Amino acid sequence: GFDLIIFDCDGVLVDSEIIAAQVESRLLTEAGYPISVEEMGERFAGMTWKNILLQVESEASIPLSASLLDKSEKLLDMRLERDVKIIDGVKFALSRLTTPRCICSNSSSHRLDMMLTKVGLKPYFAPHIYSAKDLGADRVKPKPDIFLHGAAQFGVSPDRVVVVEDSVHGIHGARAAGMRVIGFTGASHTYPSHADRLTDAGAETVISRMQDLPAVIAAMAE
Ligand SMILES: [Mg+2]
Numbered sequence: 001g002f003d004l005i006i007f008d009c010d011g012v013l014v015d016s017e018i019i020a021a022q023v024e025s026r027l028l029t030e031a032g033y034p035i036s037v038e039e040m041g042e043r044f045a046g047m048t049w050k051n052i053l054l055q056v057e058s059e060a061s062i063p064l065s066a067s068l069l070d071k072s073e074k075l076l077d078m079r080l081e082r083d084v085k086i087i088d089g090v091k092f093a094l095s096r097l098t099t100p101r102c103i104c105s106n107s108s109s110h111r112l113d114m115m116l117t118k119v120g121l122k123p124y125f126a127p128h129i130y131s132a133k134d135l136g137a138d139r140v141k142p143k144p145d146i147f148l149h150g151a152a153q154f155g156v157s158p159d160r161v162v163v164v165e166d167s168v169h170g171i172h173g174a175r176a177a178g179m180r181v182i183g184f185t186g187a188s189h190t191y192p193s194h195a196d197r198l199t200d201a202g203a204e205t206v207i208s209r210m211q212d213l214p215a216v217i218a219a220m221a222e
Contacts, residue, residue: 011166041191089210102128144177
């Protein structure tokens with residue numbers, strides 16, 4: 001009963017959020033705020049690097065410059081290109097699923113291209129790789145815009161689309177678009193409250209093995 005599967009890229013297809021968690025927790029740790037990658041998830045999930053730094057100064061008065069907003073983005077860029085890994089079970093899932101697929105992401109088109117090419121996934125999605133940054137300024141998830149755009153490119157009504165998301169903002173975006181959502185907590189940056197957070201945001205179900213996608217989708221279709 002689904003004519004389209006929409007995937008997010010970061011934290012779903014590619015293990016990119018563990019790399020952001022690593023960069024950020026180290027930049028925080030060095031600035032006077034010791035925090036492990038694991039706690040990044042528990043304390044700051046979803047939040048932008050900018051708002052995290054605002055919350056840290058608010059809660060602990062740690063001196064944190066604007067010079068450290070760009071060290072993050074450029075360190076992340078470099079580390080993604082060198083180290084980013086595909087999520088386990090992606091190629092298993094894609095082998096089995098018969099439903100058409102696309103990517104709707106908040107990441108820039110350039111970043112998407114770089115990550116997907118590296119892990120060899122691009123040919124399985126192009127040209128159906130949609131960045132919310134290309135739609136306009138401030139059209140980013142939790143707005144439904146990117147999802148509605150991807151569904152319309154396939155001519156699929158939103159009630160016939162299932163979305164795979166690891167983030168609360170993507171889940172709200174997808175629900176706001178009238179779609180059904182599978183939360184995914186199998187990426188390496190996951191944390192104890194992750195599945196509950198995804199459920200609370202409107203995930204119909206949560207999986208931690210990408211290999212479970214074919215079964216979970218079939219069951220959701222009834
Ligand atoms: Mg994501």
